[PDB]
Design a protein around this nucleic acid. Structure first.
Ligand SMILES: [Mg+2]
Ligand SMILES: [Mg+2]
Ligand SMILES: [Mg+2]
Ligand SMILES: [Mg+2]
Ligand SMILES: [Mg+2]
Ligand SMILES: [Mg+2]
Ligand SMILES: [Mg+2]
Ligand SMILES: [Mg+2]
Ligand SMILES: [Mg+2]
Ligand SMILES: [Mg+2]
Ligand SMILES: [Mg+2]
Ligand SMILES: [Mg+2]
Ligand SMILES: [Mg+2]
Ligand SMILES: [Mg+2]
Ligand SMILES: [Mg+2]
Ligand SMILES: [Mg+2]
Ligand SMILES: [Mg+2]
Ligand SMILES: [Mg+2]
Ligand SMILES: [Mg+2]
Ligand SMILES: [Mg+2]
Ligand SMILES: [Mg+2]
Lengths: 203, 143, 177, 262
RNA sequence: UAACUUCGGGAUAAGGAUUGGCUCUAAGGGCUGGCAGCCGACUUAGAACUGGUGCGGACCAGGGGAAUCCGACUGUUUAAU
RNA sequence: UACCUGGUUGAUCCUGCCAGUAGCAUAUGCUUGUCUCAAAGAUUAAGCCAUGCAUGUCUAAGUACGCACGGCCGGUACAGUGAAACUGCGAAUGGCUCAUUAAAUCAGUUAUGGUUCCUUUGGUCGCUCGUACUUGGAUAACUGUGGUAAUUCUAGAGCUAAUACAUGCCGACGGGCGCUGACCCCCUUCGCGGGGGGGAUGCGUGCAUUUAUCAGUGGUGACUCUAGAUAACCUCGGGCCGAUCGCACGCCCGGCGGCGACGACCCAUUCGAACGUCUGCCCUAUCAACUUUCGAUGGUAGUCGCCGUGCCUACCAUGGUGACCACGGGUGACGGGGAAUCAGGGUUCGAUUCCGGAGAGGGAGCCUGAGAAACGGCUACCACAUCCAAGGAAGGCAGCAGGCG
């Protein structure tokens, strides 16, 4: 069927190479996974050596890491906004390695609230939220959260994404072979690089 | 300047997003008594296939050649010259092989006709299996 | 050509059957073979119709319901014997196992009983004890070697300590002199 | 081909087995084990061709399947089990012990040893390796894995293992001066004291070594197997003491022994 | 894309494929103060979907090839055979 | 043993070839007492095949309620042989042939710090903090009813097993270690404040997988190596943590016991395999330019693959090879270790028993499996060909013999 072989194409000089053996089993390819966004569906493929690979066909959740604070939470994927390889792969919503996607802010917003005790985003304050931000707190731990206030300032670019309700992430795992949609949250210079690319693309 | 491609360009190891109130860069010595060029350390380029800054390891044979063409981008072609002995006539016979070599952009001043030292590596592309490890200017050609 | 469920057509068709399919018995492992099969719906072009009675009528039929044939074999797994006779967890099943009668010409009448399987026996408990016993030995061995290495490692780390102190002290001596 | 091979022609067998030509077409292919195919010695060859306890392939099968043969302290019922350097063959019923040691030529010589010498063996380490929880490991030349070794054991050292417990008793550090035995190459079977260690980064290091007669010979480091401090072996050496006598004086002692024997 | 050739031709040689609708994508420029803002005009290429395979849907719009005879060719000629 | 002789002329000395001369294969003719070795349908047809055989397999140790044999001691299941069938493994080795194949194969040399690896050997296998004195329902073998002209074709009914297929806990297990932390206590301070302790509850708490961050046990010439810490994840087409078997048979006050068999995740090992590095091949110029939006040479990001890589996709750049013979063609071309002839050089041969490649009439596509693009496995199409009730079924000798050509 599909072959990943070097004997079927031209030599360095440009001369045609005539094969000496037919297609081999170990020189095989398989159809692309083309992982979409939707309810979870993985098929397993038995591969060489008897091992397993996981074809993620539809995949909706995946855990992403906030590097600046080392907070890795499981998050739901919203949309695919940018892909460096092909503009056709963002018109369709397919997840491949190193494609810029949208993930919701809620798991990270909860962590920041319970770890710094500041409101981020949040342009009424519901009873569960107001109490964690104003709970009866002894002094011995008050200074603990007070010295944690010094580095509680996050990047400006991340702030308006938090009040919008969704972040920009980059997938690092290979979902068509691992079966996962893992990645990290964009920030810093890498964030402004992909923001102007998304902006100028719209025009 | 550096970000001239569609995807963000960065070294995979350096985490550039530490919270603060110059980018540190990854580099290594490749061994075998080869000195890492200075502009690979204070430079700002990136390269997957640079021996001193990418994830390629030097193994196998260490060869040498003379530069012939520099028209491809971050890869050149050198020419190896040697003699081939033929037993019937007891004479030699000049033969040549020219080969594709990945030139890292740290070796920034390279012209046609100088001697470069190339070390075998992982197959980088269809016809490239070697990186440049050092460059020696030809006779004269200093001015 | 046999009829098989699911074809849902009128005549004969060729299908690529495999292991687990009806009307095919593979020879090698993973072998598949095309065979002709007849459709699921019944028509006039066939020889036999296999019919099974799922509910009896009001009057006895001669060839079927008059004669009665028993099950040839009795239960063999320990749990199924309990289910047949509705036994508890404590009374033994070796007493209640159904025993086959053997009677043929020229031989002495005897009776035969199947070996019962999945039965709790003094043998299996001894095996269970042995499995746990090796767990004792394996965890004991790990602690001893860790502790034995730990103090030996200190001694080898100790000699490296003074070896560093003795060279700097003489280098203090060399700098002093 | 389409899978792993399972036969071995006689004329393609290793030369030191000393197999002949006209007995058969096939040679006993060593079973997979701790020693490489070309540097091992199958149990079939040792009992039928060397000791001559048997005559045919079936006779030795009866010998080893009565659990008479114990290799390195364990009973082996494989007629083609590969036994290699320094392995201790122990046939308890006849009261006899062996240790596979190269003689002055390229061959494994039969070497009867005392029962006290048969309780241990020496082995070269190949790897130093840290386990899952900081647990040190080392790998010997015959594929033994043993945990928590002495931290002073390095990659080219040799250790003395007690075959009953498989634990280290003492070790010899690889350094100049120590006695050596060459396990491979053109010089294998020779014995001498290590003289120099010349290292090539990337290539194979060479070891210069001279025997008791002052002859000097080199070899690659992968063929060096230290067998003692200074010039005292930790094992009993075979006849010839690992001194290779050239062809000139080999006949000189061959006939002079003959005219001494008559 | 051939024979042949006065090397200019033969030539639209001969012989094949595609062509709708809809929704998109990319490239191609000005003015003002390697950037930013404000303006645009038509084209080309590619992709997905989709119709009873239907698309230069009417109109417009070269049948072709192999040879022989004569006149080189363009041009002119018996208004009414 | 570094070798010559006849033949152009009326005669001579040359050039020069023709013919003699000696081996070595292939065939053929005539002849043929003994004995030891010994090649043998390669050359033309990798043309076509009747018939028979060439791959099966049980130990004390997976599943015996086939009186098929068989002991008596019964009734506490199974004495013990044991056909059959389920299960496991093997069938990817060997054997045959040389059609394809000209930097391809192959050879010597090196790399995998860029990967898979059944089996063997050695390690790991209460590290995990959460009906077990043993859980479930099917199915062969068997009994019985059948179909077809026909096959190693199978249907419906009745039973019954597992080391087949599934489900699944107790113990170690009593706690530690990280986060929270209600609270409490102590010291200093007028006091806020500052410092030091103990601390309920609750969450996590093994290895393997995937991602991100931090620090820098052991090793390398050189790691983005091995190990460590943190935050999470962990596929229902779920990953391991034993619901298996045999010999003996004892010790305590029902509980403990030895030696094995089998099976399992991972790491090493072995046998390898697969991609690469460098150098090396016959004739031909009446083959001088070749390759490229139908990948040609590179870049970036990915997809696929066991991994590296235009392997493939998208966007880019215009590259790459050649008179030092590229590209194209031919080969009566499988390569090599080798064979014949030989002064010193060489010339010719290598289908042929050892190593490596390829292929099973020609192509193509797959299943199972650690390993196959397998053909004494399957599915198509082409050619050829077999039985037939005319509805259908079956096929692959370049295996051993044997037959036609
Ligand atoms: Mg010569
Ligand atoms: Mg073979
Ligand atoms: Mg014409
Ligand atoms: Mg004419
Ligand atoms: Mg005219
Ligand atoms: Mg007119
Ligand atoms: Mg004349
Ligand atoms: Mg005459
Ligand atoms: Mg002649
Ligand atoms: Mg006679
Ligand atoms: Mg006779
Ligand atoms: Mg031929
Ligand atoms: Mg033939
Ligand atoms: Mg040909
Ligand atoms: Mg050929
Ligand atoms: Mg050959
Ligand atoms: Mg094949
Ligand atoms: Mg044939
Ligand atoms: Mg095939
Ligand atoms: Mg056959
Ligand atoms: Mg075969």
């Amino acid at each position: 069927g599909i072959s990943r072989d070097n004997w079927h194409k031209r030599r360095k000089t440009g001369g045609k190479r005539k094969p000496y053996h037919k297609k081999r089993k170990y020189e095989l390819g398989r159809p692309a996974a083309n992982t979409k966004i939707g309810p979870r569906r993985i098929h397993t493929v038995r591969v060489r050596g008897g091992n397993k690979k996981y074809r993620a066909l539809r995949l909706d959740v995946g855990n992403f890491s906030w590097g600046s604070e080392c907070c890795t939470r499981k998050t739901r994927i919203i949309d695919v906004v940018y892909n460096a390889s092909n503009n056709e792969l963002v018109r369709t919503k397919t997840l491949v390695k190193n494609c810029i996607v949208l993930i919701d802010s809620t798991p990270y917003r909860q962590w920041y609230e319970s770890h710094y005790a500041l409101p981020l985003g949040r342009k009424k304050l519901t009873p569960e939220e107001e109490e964690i931000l104003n709970k009866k707190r002894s002094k011995k731990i008050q200074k603990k959260y007070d010295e944690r206030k010094k580095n509680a300032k996050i990047s400006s670019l991340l702030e308006e994404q938090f009040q919008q309700g969704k972040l920009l992430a980059c997938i690092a795992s290979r979902p068509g072979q691992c079966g996962r949609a893992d990645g990290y949250v964009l920030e810093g210079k890498e964030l402004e690089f992909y923001l102007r690319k998304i902006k100028a693309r719209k025009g | 300047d550096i970000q001239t491609e569609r995807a963000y360009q960065k070294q995979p190891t350096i985490f550039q997003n530490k919270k603060r109130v110059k980018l540190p860069r990854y580099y290594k010595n490749i061994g075998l008594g080869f000195k890492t060029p200075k502009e690979a350390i204070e430079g700002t380029y990136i390269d997957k296939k640079c021996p001193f800054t990418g994830n390629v390891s030097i193994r196998g044979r260490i060869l040498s050649g003379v530069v012939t063409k520099m028209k491809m981008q971050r890869t050149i072609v050198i020419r190896r010259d040697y003699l081939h002995y033929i037993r019937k006539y007891n004479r030699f016979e000049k033969r040549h092989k020219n080969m594709s070599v990945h030139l890292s952009p740290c070796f920034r001043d390279v012209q046609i006709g100088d001697i470069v030292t190339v070390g075998e590596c992982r197959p980088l592309s269809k016809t490239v299996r070697f990186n440049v490890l050092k460059v020696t200017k030809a006779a004269g050609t200093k001015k | 050509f046999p009829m098989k469920q699911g074809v849902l057509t009128h005549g004969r068709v060729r299908l690529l059957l495999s292991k687990g399919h009806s009307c095919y018995r593979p020879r090698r492992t993973g072998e598949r073979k095309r065979k002709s099969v007849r459709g699921c719906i019944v028509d006039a072009n066939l020889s036999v119709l296999n019919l099974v009675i799922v509910k009896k009528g009001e009057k006895d039929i001669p060839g079927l319901t008059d004669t009665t044939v028993p099950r040839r074999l009795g239960p063999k797994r320990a749990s199924r014997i309990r289910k047949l006779f509705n036994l508890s967890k404590e009374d033994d099943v070796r007493q209640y196992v159904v025993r086959k009668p053997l009677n043929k010409e020229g031989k002495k009448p005897r009776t035969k009983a199947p070996k019962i399987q999945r039965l709790v026996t003094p043998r299996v408990l001894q095996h269970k004890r042995r499995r746990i016993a090796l767990k004792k030995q394996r965890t004991k061995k790990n602690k001893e070697e860790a502790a034995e290495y730990a103090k030996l490692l200190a001694k080898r780390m100790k000699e490296a300590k003074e070896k560093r102190q003795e060279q700097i002290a003489k280098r203090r001596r060399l700098s002093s002199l | 081909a389409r899978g792993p091979k399972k036969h071995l022609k006689r004329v393609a067998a290793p030369k030191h087995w000393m197999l002949d030509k006209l007995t058969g077409v096939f040679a006993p292919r060593p079973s997979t084990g701790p020693h490489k195919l070309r540097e091992c010695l199958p149990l079939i060859i040792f009992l039928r061709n060397r000791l001559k306890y048997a005559l045919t392939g079936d006779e030795v099968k009866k010998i080893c399947m009565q659990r008479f043969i114990k290799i390195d302290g364990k009973v082996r019922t494989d007629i083609t089990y590969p036994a290699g350097f320094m392995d201790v063959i122990s046939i308890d019923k006849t009261g006899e012990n062996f240790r596979l040691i190269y003689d002055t030529k390229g061959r494994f010589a039969v070497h009867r040893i005392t029962p006290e010498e048969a309780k241990y063996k020496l082995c070269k380490v190949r790897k130093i390796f840290v386990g899952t929880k900081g647990i040190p490991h080392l790998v010997t030349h015959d594929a033994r894995t043993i945990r928590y070794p002495d931290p002073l054991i390095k990659v080219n050292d040799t250790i003395q293992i007690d075959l009953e417990t498989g634990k280290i008793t003492d070790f010899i550090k690889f350094d100049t001066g120590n006695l050596c035995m060459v396990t491979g190459g053109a010089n294998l079977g020779r014995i001498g004291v290590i003289t120099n260690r010349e290292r090539h980064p990337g290539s194979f290091d060479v070891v210069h070594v001279k025997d008791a007669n002052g002859n000097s010979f080199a070899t690659r480091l992968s063929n060096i197997f230290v067998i003692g401090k200074g010039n005292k072996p930790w094992i009993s050496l075979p006849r010839g003491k690992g001194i290779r006598l050239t062809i000139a004086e080999e006949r000189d002692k061959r006939l002079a022994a003959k005219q001494s024997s008559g």
